Scaffold this active site. Structure first.
Site, PDB file in Angstrom:
ATOM      1  N   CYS A 193       0.813  -1.223   0.000  1.00  0.00           N
ATOM      2  CA  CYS A 193       0.000   0.000   0.000  1.00  0.00           C
ATOM      3  C   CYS A 193       0.850   1.277   0.000  1.00  0.00           C
ATOM      4  O   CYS A 193       1.629   1.523   0.924  1.00  0.00           O
ATOM      5  CB  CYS A 193      -0.943   0.033   1.208  1.00  0.00           C
ATOM      6  SG  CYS A 193      -1.933   1.544   1.324  1.00  0.00           S
TER       7      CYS A 193
ATOM      8  N   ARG B 214       0.019   4.523   2.839  1.00  0.00           N
ATOM      9  CA  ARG B 214       0.189   4.342   4.283  1.00  0.00           C
ATOM     10  C   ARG B 214       0.546   5.565   5.136  1.00  0.00           C
ATOM     11  O   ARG B 214       0.549   5.478   6.362  1.00  0.00           O
ATOM     12  CB  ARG B 214       1.174   3.202   4.562  1.00  0.00           C
ATOM     13  CG  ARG B 214       0.552   1.823   4.367  1.00  0.00           C
ATOM     14  CD  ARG B 214       1.570   0.749   4.617  1.00  0.00           C
ATOM     15  NE  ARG B 214       2.526   0.634   3.506  1.00  0.00           N
ATOM     16  CZ  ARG B 214       3.701   0.028   3.599  1.00  0.00           C
ATOM     17  NH1 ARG B 214       4.076  -0.492   4.760  1.00  0.00           N
ATOM     18  NH2 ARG B 214       4.504  -0.053   2.536  1.00  0.00           N
TER      19      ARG B 214
ATOM     20  N   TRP C 162      -9.326   6.101  -0.380  1.00  0.00           N
ATOM     21  CA  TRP C 162      -9.719   6.810  -1.592  1.00  0.00           C
ATOM     22  C   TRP C 162      -8.807   6.370  -2.730  1.00  0.00           C
ATOM     23  O   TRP C 162      -7.795   5.715  -2.496  1.00  0.00           O
ATOM     24  CB  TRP C 162      -9.696   8.325  -1.409  1.00  0.00           C
ATOM     25  CG  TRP C 162      -8.404   8.886  -0.889  1.00  0.00           C
ATOM     26  CD1 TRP C 162      -7.255   9.137  -1.609  1.00  0.00           C
ATOM     27  CD2 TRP C 162      -8.132   9.279   0.455  1.00  0.00           C
ATOM     28  NE1 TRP C 162      -6.289   9.664  -0.779  1.00  0.00           N
ATOM     29  CE2 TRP C 162      -6.801   9.761   0.491  1.00  0.00           C
ATOM     30  CE3 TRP C 162      -8.886   9.284   1.636  1.00  0.00           C
ATOM     31  CZ2 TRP C 162      -6.210  10.235   1.666  1.00  0.00           C
ATOM     32  CZ3 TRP C 162      -8.298   9.757   2.804  1.00  0.00           C
ATOM     33  CH2 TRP C 162      -6.973  10.230   2.809  1.00  0.00           C
TER      34      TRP C 162
ATOM     35  N   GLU D 270      -5.391   3.705 -10.640  1.00  0.00           N
ATOM     36  CA  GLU D 270      -6.163   2.486 -10.387  1.00  0.00           C
ATOM     37  C   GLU D 270      -7.304   2.403 -11.383  1.00  0.00           C
ATOM     38  O   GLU D 270      -7.581   1.346 -11.939  1.00  0.00           O
ATOM     39  CB  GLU D 270      -6.738   2.488  -8.962  1.00  0.00           C
ATOM     40  CG  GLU D 270      -5.691   2.398  -7.871  1.00  0.00           C
ATOM     41  CD  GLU D 270      -6.295   2.289  -6.479  1.00  0.00           C
ATOM     42  OE1 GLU D 270      -6.742   1.172  -6.131  1.00  0.00           O
ATOM     43  OE2 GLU D 270      -6.344   3.314  -5.744  1.00  0.00           O
TER      44      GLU D 270
HETATM   45  C1  HEM Z   1      -6.446   6.427   2.087  1.00  0.00           C
HETATM   46  C2  HEM Z   1      -6.071   6.333   0.804  1.00  0.00           C
HETATM   47  C3  HEM Z   1      -5.409   5.064   0.216  1.00  0.00           C
HETATM   48  C4  HEM Z   1      -4.774   5.036  -0.956  1.00  0.00           C
HETATM   49  C5  HEM Z   1      -4.577   6.235  -1.915  1.00  0.00           C
HETATM   50  C6  HEM Z   1      -4.293   3.690  -1.179  1.00  0.00           C
HETATM   51  C7  HEM Z   1      -3.583   3.248  -2.281  1.00  0.00           C
HETATM   52  C8  HEM Z   1      -3.352   1.920  -2.565  1.00  0.00           C
HETATM   53  C9  HEM Z   1      -3.081   1.367  -3.880  1.00  0.00           C
HETATM   54  C10 HEM Z   1      -3.020   2.203  -5.180  1.00  0.00           C
HETATM   55  C11 HEM Z   1      -2.897   0.044  -3.750  1.00  0.00           C
HETATM   56  C12 HEM Z   1      -2.599  -0.958  -4.895  1.00  0.00           C
HETATM   57  C13 HEM Z   1      -3.925  -1.682  -5.117  1.00  0.00           C
HETATM   58  C14 HEM Z   1      -4.030  -2.306  -6.480  1.00  0.00           C
HETATM   59  O1  HEM Z   1      -3.210  -1.956  -7.364  1.00  0.00           O
HETATM   60  O2  HEM Z   1      -4.952  -3.153  -6.673  1.00  0.00           O
HETATM   61  C15 HEM Z   1      -3.054  -0.291  -2.342  1.00  0.00           C
HETATM   62  C16 HEM Z   1      -2.939  -1.538  -1.770  1.00  0.00           C
HETATM   63  C17 HEM Z   1      -3.362  -1.919  -0.510  1.00  0.00           C
HETATM   64  N1  HEM Z   1      -3.942  -1.112   0.476  1.00  0.00           N
HETATM   65 FE1  HEM Z   1      -3.984   0.947   0.354  1.00  0.00          FE
HETATM   66  N2  HEM Z   1      -4.646   2.917  -0.092  1.00  0.00           N
HETATM   67  C18 HEM Z   1      -5.355   3.724   0.790  1.00  0.00           C
HETATM   68  C19 HEM Z   1      -5.921   3.302   1.978  1.00  0.00           C
HETATM   69  C20 HEM Z   1      -5.903   2.038   2.537  1.00  0.00           C
HETATM   70  C21 HEM Z   1      -6.622   1.596   3.732  1.00  0.00           C
HETATM   71  C22 HEM Z   1      -7.580   2.478   4.576  1.00  0.00           C
HETATM   72  C23 HEM Z   1      -6.323   0.303   3.952  1.00  0.00           C
HETATM   73  C24 HEM Z   1      -6.786  -0.654   5.085  1.00  0.00           C
HETATM   74  C25 HEM Z   1      -7.269  -0.262   6.281  1.00  0.00           C
HETATM   75  C26 HEM Z   1      -5.398  -0.111   2.906  1.00  0.00           C
HETATM   76  C27 HEM Z   1      -4.849  -1.364   2.774  1.00  0.00           C
HETATM   77  C28 HEM Z   1      -4.251  -1.847   1.622  1.00  0.00           C
HETATM   78  C29 HEM Z   1      -3.861  -3.223   1.409  1.00  0.00           C
HETATM   79  C30 HEM Z   1      -3.996  -4.427   2.371  1.00  0.00           C
HETATM   80  C31 HEM Z   1      -3.265  -3.262   0.011  1.00  0.00           C
HETATM   81  C32 HEM Z   1      -2.718  -4.521  -0.678  1.00  0.00           C
HETATM   82  C33 HEM Z   1      -3.893  -5.019  -1.507  1.00  0.00           C
HETATM   83  C34 HEM Z   1      -3.601  -6.369  -2.099  1.00  0.00           C
HETATM   84  O3  HEM Z   1      -2.599  -7.021  -1.685  1.00  0.00           O
HETATM   85  O4  HEM Z   1      -4.389  -6.791  -2.989  1.00  0.00           O
HETATM   86  N3  HEM Z   1      -5.179   0.959   2.062  1.00  0.00           N
HETATM   87  N4  HEM Z   1      -3.327   0.883  -1.646  1.00  0.00           N
HETATM   88  C1  LIG Z   2      -7.940  -9.256  -6.344  1.00  0.00           C
HETATM   89  C2  LIG Z   2      -6.831  -9.646  -7.296  1.00  0.00           C
HETATM   90  C3  LIG Z   2      -6.785 -10.967  -7.731  1.00  0.00           C
HETATM   91  C4  LIG Z   2      -5.789 -11.377  -8.609  1.00  0.00           C
HETATM   92  N1  LIG Z   2      -4.867 -10.511  -9.046  1.00  0.00           N
HETATM   93  C5  LIG Z   2      -4.884  -9.232  -8.648  1.00  0.00           C
HETATM   94  C6  LIG Z   2      -5.854  -8.762  -7.766  1.00  0.00           C
HETATM   95  C7  LIG Z   2      -5.769  -7.292  -7.401  1.00  0.00           C
HETATM   96  C8  LIG Z   2      -5.532  -6.957  -5.933  1.00  0.00           C
HETATM   97  C9  LIG Z   2      -6.581  -5.923  -5.567  1.00  0.00           C
HETATM   98  N2  LIG Z   2      -6.124  -4.989  -4.536  1.00  0.00           N
HETATM   99  C10 LIG Z   2      -7.041  -3.853  -4.656  1.00  0.00           C
HETATM  100  C11 LIG Z   2      -6.964  -2.798  -3.574  1.00  0.00           C
HETATM  101  C12 LIG Z   2      -6.763  -3.079  -2.224  1.00  0.00           C
HETATM  102  C13 LIG Z   2      -6.723  -2.035  -1.288  1.00  0.00           C
HETATM  103  C14 LIG Z   2      -6.886  -0.718  -1.712  1.00  0.00           C
HETATM  104  C15 LIG Z   2      -6.871   0.346  -0.807  1.00  0.00           C
HETATM  105  C16 LIG Z   2      -7.026   1.643  -1.315  1.00  0.00           C
HETATM  106  C17 LIG Z   2      -7.188   1.855  -2.690  1.00  0.00           C
HETATM  107  N3  LIG Z   2      -7.332   3.102  -3.227  1.00  0.00           N
HETATM  108  N4  LIG Z   2      -7.210   0.802  -3.521  1.00  0.00           N
HETATM  109  C18 LIG Z   2      -7.066  -0.453  -3.064  1.00  0.00           C
HETATM  110  C19 LIG Z   2      -7.115  -1.486  -3.985  1.00  0.00           C
END
Ligand code: HEM
Ligand SMILES: Cc1ccncc1CCCNCc1ccc2ccc(N)nc2c1
Ligand code: HEM
Ligand SMILES: Cc1ccncc1CCCNCc1ccc2ccc(N)nc2c1
Ligand SMILES: C[C@H](O)[C@H](O)[C@H]1CNc2nc(N)[nH]c(=O)c2N1
Ligand SMILES: C[C@H](O)[C@H](O)[C@H]1CNc2nc(N)[nH]c(=O)c2N1
Ligand SMILES: [Zn+2]
Lengths: 413, 408
Positions: free
Chosen positions: B107, B110, B279, B284
């Site tokens: 993420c 953070r 947000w 994305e």
């Molecule tokens: C507040 C604004 C936030 C922004 C701009 C943001 C941004 C991002 C982005 C761009 C990703 C990549 C996701 C993807 O490409 O599918 C990500 C991943 C992730 N975010 Fe954040 N995030 C935010 C808030 C949060 C919050 C509130 C949480 C949890 C309480 C969180 C937990 C995670 C986790 C666990 C991942 C990994 C997702 C995965 O492994 O599929 N994020 N974040």
């Molecule tokens: C679900 C999946 C399955 C297989 N390959 C790739 C994926 C993509 C992983 C999706 N993670 C999306 C994600 C998680 C947390 C977020 C938090 C904030 C944000 N703006 N976007 C998020 C977007």
């Protein structure tokens, strides 16, 4: 380690099975508790160290020519062992040298261009004794590889390390690069990446033109002696002035670049033998020039100047003025090379070819080590197929390795 | 050993000690790196995990080895003894949820980690209850466009036969439909989930951007369908500030990214339903949702309207159209006063966050493969930043899709 590791492509859902990782020889830097995948980089061999390394390689070679366990294989093994025992080292046959060099390239996990690995012209320079001789070999390489713009991949291999006090080295990081000059006011003229090397050249007697695109002299070390300066004949240095197909003003930026990427500071390791001077060359992927060389903040750094010429709104990052300019610069680079008939490949074509290569390697070899962090291009990552491709990274030998910069270790005579 | 990470642009070197705290596996070994691979209880297992967590909690509030800390450990042990599990205190739940976010190596957002509204939904017993809690989350987090980070936490796993699950991958997503002519209408990523909703009685409008119903499973029962009240679903019509034809593409997206299929692990406890929301970062939507070949796949249509030459890849027509689409998304959200961050501002904040974390925490686990944005990578500062990736708990984890496990 399980015998079968699977990788998935998340876009095509194609699953590949890797068995070749079982042949991995060296450490990656990762452990079960930490991954160092984005870390840039995470005295000679004894007789007893050299024995199993040589046998491993000789076995690999004879297995590759379908003569494993043959009389010729057993005889070569015995001959190598005898040589190591009586001289503490051994000499590769020409066939083995060629095989080893092609496979070091085949094994280079960071290289997106490996579909070409079997078409590599190998120049054996192991008879070379002086810096003048190194200069001759390098000129010949540059001329062959350049081929008037129809670039041909090549490697020139100088004598292997002996005791470590007689190393051949090319002090340059690439055979052709541009000088950088730090100014009294803190500004930099030319390529900031090359300031240190430029200063060393100047100290050794090079008289610098002090322009923005001055081709650096070769600084060549033979047999552990102090390095010597040589000017590459300018007719051997193919350059491309950069212009844009729409923007008539782009040429007024005065940019150009050289046609031949020829990395010269790596170490080639074959069968436990170390070739500390092994300049090799291919051709460019456009982003190397258009994104990194031109747009890295610590390099030529042209985004602002281009954006201003494009009349872009540069007041907010969210207008994406940088991204917009970055694309136009990369269009110009590709356009200028193709117009001058100098080989270049765009990042879409290159990554698409790499995927096919990887699939073929999994099919015929049982895998293809690949470093995602390096393979995915520095712009438009996810619109190339490699972004969606799971990869496994591991180290196979023969291999290209990094080595310390020679001015840091050299004992001046 | 202390590990150093270098930024190759600034030459700043940071020193990581925090990795020494991890005990969970990465997937890599000394011989093979799996950095680009997507996915590489009992009472006896439970107490040391609980103890580990209670210990770091009392350490974080500078009362390690206090009477409170000792009483808590004693309390937790008895509870695990007599019930095969334990319940977190509210303070602990909030601390744990914030730290799961803080520890999420993938993420880039953070810097916001300590600003998280935690909704305790552990008293929930039915899918109707789940729906109420989710509506409240959506309303609070959306906040008329001024988005606020939030998480809603449903009861933890007991025996694995009574899981609470949100079957949706995000609270708000668009349906996808397989067409007779073999094409896909809407979002192809959601075709399967859409079919399940239809099978369960959802009457599909069969358009390009149909908001899916919620499908909610409480206490291991069969999931139930609910329509999110539309006034709670904030959407943005996508237009371009220069190309007046862009709005004619009929594109839109939703303002609230609310991931609902992850598992939150705290002190050995498993929260299988924990929808959370922040947000968007513009890429994305503009790069992945809109331009992935397997998603909405709009590059070709957009490049056509731009009258680009699309015969050769080296014209970079794809890259050109890609930038314009991402300009449109940012412009549209901003013009509608809906929170969004561009990849430049976001990655810049992430570097500052890393620096903060090294200073106050001894490090920051980070996954370069995920942190670097899917466009214009090396013109963002994270491309040049060496990162170390390691696994810390509390954490967010992946779990299987419920339709591959659930018996009806
Ligand atoms: C507040 C604004 C936030 C922004 C701009 C943001 C941004 C991002 C982005 C761009 C990703 C990549 C996701 C993807 O490409 O599918 C990500 C991943 C992730 N975010 Fe954040 N995030 C935010 C808030 C949060 C919050 C509130 C949480 C949890 C309480 C969180 C937990 C995670 C986790 C666990 C991942 C990994 C997702 C995965 O492994 O599929 N994020 N974040
Ligand atoms: C679900 C999946 C399955 C297989 N390959 C790739 C994926 C993509 C992983 C999706 N993670 C999306 C994600 C998680 C947390 C977020 C938090 C904030 C944000 N703006 N976007 C998020 C977007
Ligand atoms: C034929 C056309 C070739 C293309 C298009 C190509 C492409 C690339 C690119 C784009 C990189 C990343 C470089 C960077 O970002 O700095 C790379 C790395 C590399 N290439 Fe290739 N390459 C080619 C030929 C070769 C040849 C002929 C060799 C050796 C015989 C080779 C060996 C390597 C090695 C060892 C790396 C890793 C470099 C490092 O870690 O610094 N390549 N290649
Ligand atoms: C060594 C270093 C350290 C820090 N930052 C940047 C660098 C430069 C990375 C050097 N590798 C460049 C390289 C190597 C082999 C290539 C082969 C073909 C090609 N087209 N380009 C290459 C480009
Ligand atoms: C920190 C990071 O490892 C570093 O910036 C890498 C990222 N990926 C790269 N990829 C390529 N092809 N070339 C590079 O120089 C780099 N640099
Ligand atoms: C194969 C690779 O691991 C996969 O495509 C990853 C790459 N990096 C990513 N990065 C982000 N932020 N989101 C993703 O879905 C992915 N996908
Ligand atoms: Zn790793």
């Amino acid at each position: 380690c399980p015998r079968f590791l699977k990788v998935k492509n998340w876009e095509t859902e194609v699953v590949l099975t890797d068995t070749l990782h079982l042949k991995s020889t060296l450490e990656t830097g990762c452990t079960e508790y930490i991954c160092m995948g984005s870390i840039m980089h995470p005295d000679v061999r004894t007789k007893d160290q050299l024995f199993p390394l040589a046998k491993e390689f000789i076995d690999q070679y004879y297995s590759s020519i379908k003569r494993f366990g043959s009389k010729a294989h057993m005889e070569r093994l015995e001959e190598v062992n005898k040589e190591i025992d009586t001289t503490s080292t051994y000499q590769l046959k020409d066939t083995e040298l060629i095989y080893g060099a092609k496979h070091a390239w085949r094994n280079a996990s960071r290289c997106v261009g490996r579909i070409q690995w079997s078409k590599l012209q190998v120049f054996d320079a192991r008879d070379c004794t002086t810096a003048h001789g190194m200069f001759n070999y390098i000129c010949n390489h540059v001329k062959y590889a350049t081929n008037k713009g129809n670039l041909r991949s090549a490697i020139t291999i100088f004598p292997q390390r002996t005791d470590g006090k007689h190393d051949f080295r090319v002090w340059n990081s690439q055979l052709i690069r541009y000088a950088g000059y730090k100014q009294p006011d803190g500004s930099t003229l030319g390529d900031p990446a090359n300031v240190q090397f430029t200063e060393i050249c100047i100290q050794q007697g090079w008289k610098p033109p002090r322009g923005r695109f001055d081709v650096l002299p070769l600084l060549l070390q033979a047999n552990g002696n102090d390095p010597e300066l040589f000017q590459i004949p300018p007719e051997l240095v193919l350059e491309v002035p950069i212009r844009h197909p729409k923007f008539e003003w782009f040429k007024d930026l005065g940019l150009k670049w050289y046609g031949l990427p020829a990395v010269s500071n790596m170490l080639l390791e074959i069968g436990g033998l170390e070739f500390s001077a092994c300049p090799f060359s291919g051709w460019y992927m456009g982003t190397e020039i258009g994104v990194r060389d031109y747009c890295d903040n610590s390099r030529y750094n042209i985004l602002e100047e281009v954006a201003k010429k494009m009349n872009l709104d540069m007041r907010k990052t969210s207008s994406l003025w940088k991204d917009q300019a970055l694309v136009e610069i990369n269009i110009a680079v590709l356009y200028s090379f193709q117009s001058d008939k100098v080989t270049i490949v765009d990042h879409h074509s290159a990554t698409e070819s790499f995927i096919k290569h990887m699939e073929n390697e999994y099919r015929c070899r049982g895998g293809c080590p690949a470093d995602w962090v390096w393979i995915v291009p520095p712009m438009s990552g996810s619109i190339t197929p490699v972004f969606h491709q799971e990869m496994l990274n591991y180290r196979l030998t023969p291999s290209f390795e990094y080595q310390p910069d020679p001015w840091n270790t050299h004992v001046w005579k």
